[PDB]
Structure 1
Amino acid sequence: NIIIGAMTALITPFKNGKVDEQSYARLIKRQIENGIDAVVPVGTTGESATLTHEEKRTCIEIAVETCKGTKVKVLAGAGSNATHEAVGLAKFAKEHGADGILSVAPYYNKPTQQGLYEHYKAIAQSVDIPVLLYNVPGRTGCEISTDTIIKLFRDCENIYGVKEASGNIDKCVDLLAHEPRMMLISGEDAINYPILSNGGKGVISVTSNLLPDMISALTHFALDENYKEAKKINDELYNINKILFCESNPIPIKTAMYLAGLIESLEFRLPLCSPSKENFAKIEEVMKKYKIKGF
């Protein structure tokens, strides 16, 4: 079983230091109504590092409850740099109705390839729901090698692919050339189309928070092999895809959602904070050429 297509790494809106549960639910329904195939609660874009275990439960339960009765899947973030914790978060995400888990590579402690294998093997054997690996070396300080990804894909039934955020289209070829049955997912919006055109089967997008219809159309154009139309949308989105990373994700996207009136307060949890006034103006200017769907 797999979870693919156009997917959104959901932001986590805050109101006076607390999770805005009403805004969280209405933001997910806005994603559902704009053709998004799955939502990723408490991911990296959702500020998972600063959320309590209770708040992660609430965000996952809201996502599951909002997506019931639709095709939209819930791919909950449940990674950790401690394997015993990552196993607990995986079991915790399943108990709350998630269709699958996105489990980031252990950050900071830099496990070896052997350790990465044993880390994910313990996670996969703890649940019966699909597990999508998440490789983002710029954040974690380590890399899940192609061989390690392929071994985990072949040895673990529920591990069905990887979300790549590594700016390495060479590795994307390497992955799908040696194991074309895995689901390569783009975790980097600017290169959504090149990953999809090489056989990638979906994206986990940051831009889709603001422009879910455009990311969805891009993905489904690519899945129907209409690469001209898929590339066109990807080219159209390049400016917004880069300006959403002038500061660290999710600082720009939350700023954009606030500027569009899609979230009610521009609140982060430290060490995340508001962007500079120069980047605030940059985001506000680039957004003006994109039509932002309302509620």
Structure 2
Amino acid sequence: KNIIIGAMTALITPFKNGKVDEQSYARLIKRQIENGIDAVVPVGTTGESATLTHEEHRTCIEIAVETCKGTKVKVLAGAGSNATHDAVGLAKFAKEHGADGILSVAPYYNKPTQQGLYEHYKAIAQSVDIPVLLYNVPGRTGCEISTDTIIKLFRDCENIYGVKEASGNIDKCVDLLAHEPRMMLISGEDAINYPILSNGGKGVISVTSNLLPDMISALTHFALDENYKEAKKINDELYNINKILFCESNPIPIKTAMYLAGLIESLEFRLPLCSPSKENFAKIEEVMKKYKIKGF
């Protein structure tokens, strides 16, 4: 199977005057490229995919694809939807417009059964010939892709090559890789990046790397080379910022940190997301002082 692994960033989507700041988006992607990241994920959860129009979603995939041409960096395009018809449409767009693969979140809100999840992902995977990474985040979807469903999709669909796990369940990661060691398990939870990598996970899709791309890339590459002492030391170092970035719902804290770092121009969200509380604003600012934040 063709795969997309390594250190990857779930890119934030910056806004200016209620519109996607497209120049800022391209600049942020180049900062990721220049700090050792292996792939970028435009318009995932961290990118506010729920509040982007279909047009904006497509534009952000194209900017990422265009910005990564001539580099080793891949584009794993966010293409999930709780309607299979729309997920297939986004998958086909990403494939036709030069993405290296797609991320596809488990359907949210409508809680499909395991049989429904299987048919959803099989319809997506059959619609394109690029790699597909499943994405399990039950705290946000109300749904869970069981280990059995994940393994069946991996074995039955040629292009489904792994899963991004954001469930905080290390037993499930042992279960997955013990029964199917060929799949690419990708960490979707920054605080436990190293435990997942040390059990044979092959990458991370990181929120923290928006702010500290060099540290997340280093952790991942240390771990992939089995330099576990160095990988754990960075994962330990990053614990405080990894937690503070979820004091409020992602991406409110990371966008706050990017603004406090002077990386984005305005602290703008699309409703129902909004800026954090005054208290959390101060907590994020205080934790940031313990880290060295690269500029442009």
Smaller-chain TM-score bracket:
over 0.9
- Structure 1 contact 172–195 (Cα < 8 Å) conserved: yes
Shift of 1:282: 0.3
- In 2, Cα distance between the equivalents of 1:97 and 1:57? 12
- In 2, Cα distance between the equivalents of 1:261 and 1:180? 42
| Residue-by-residue CA offset, 1:40-81 (whole Å, 9 max, x unaligned) | 001100000000111111111110011000110000100011
- In 2, Cα distance between the equivalents of 1:81 and 1:12? 21
Compare 54-63 and 37-46 and name the one that shifted more: 54-63
- Structure 1 contact 146–171 (Cα < 8 Å) conserved: yes
| Residue-by-residue CA offset, 1:74-102 (whole Å, 9 max, x unaligned) | 00100011111111111011122111000
Shift of 1:235: 0.2
Shift of 1:201: 0.1
SS at match of 2:262: coil
Counterpart in the other structure of 1:27: 28
- In 2, Cα distance between the equivalents of 1:46 and 1:280? 20
Give the root-mean-square deviation of aligned CA atoms: 0.4
Are residues 1:2 and 2:3 paired? yes
- In 2, Cα distance between the equivalents of 1:224 and 1:60? 31
- In 2, Cα distance between the equivalents of 1:162 and 1:146? 10
- In 2, Cα distance between the equivalents of 1:183 and 1:39? 17
- Structure 1 contact 268–274 (Cα < 8 Å) conserved: yes
| Residue-by-residue CA offset, 1:163-188 (whole Å, 9 max, x unaligned) | 00000000000000000000000000
- In 1, Cα distance between the equivalents of 2:24 and 2:80? 24
- In 2, Cα distance between the equivalents of 1:137 and 1:54? 27
Shift of 1:225: 0.2
- In 1, Cα distance between the equivalents of 2:268 and 2:238? 25
- In 2, Cα distance between the equivalents of 1:52 and 1:101? 18
Alignment of 1:1-295 (within 5 A): 1-295=2-296
**TM-score, normalized by length of structure 2?**
0.99
- In 1, Cα distance between the equivalents of 2:112 and 2:53? 25
SS at match of 2:289: helix
Unaligned runs of 5+ in 1: none
- In 2, Cα distance between the equivalents of 1:35 and 1:22? 21
SS at match of 1:286: helix
- Structure 1 contact 176–199 (Cα < 8 Å) conserved: yes
Q: Which runs of 4+ in 1 moved over 2 A?
A: none
- In 2, Cα distance between the equivalents of 1:57 and 1:124? 19
| Residue-by-residue CA offset, 1:223-275 (whole Å, 9 max, x unaligned) | 00001000000000000000000000000000000000000111000000000
Number of residue pairs aligned between Structure 1 and Structure 2 = 295
- In 2, Cα distance between the equivalents of 1:76 and 1:265? 25
- Structure 1 contact 83–123 (Cα < 8 Å) conserved: yes
| Residue-by-residue CA offset, 1:191-227 (whole Å, 9 max, x unaligned) | 0000000000000000000000000000000000001
- In 1, Cα distance between the equivalents of 2:85 and 2:51? 19
| Residue-by-residue CA offset, 1:110-147 (whole Å, 9 max, x unaligned) | 00001100000000000000000000000000100000
- In 1, Cα distance between the equivalents of 2:188 and 2:276? 22
- In 2, Cα distance between the equivalents of 1:108 and 1:169? 25
- In 2, Cα distance between the equivalents of 1:65 and 1:162? 26
SS at match of 2:267: coil
- Structure 1 contact 57–96 (Cα < 8 Å) conserved: no
- Structure 1 contact 5–220 (Cα < 8 Å) conserved: yes
SS at match of 1:94: helix
- Structure 1 contact 113–148 (Cα < 8 Å) conserved: yes
- In 2, Cα distance between the equivalents of 1:56 and 1:95? 14
Shift of 1:106: 0.4
- In 2, Cα distance between the equivalents of 1:32 and 1:154? 32
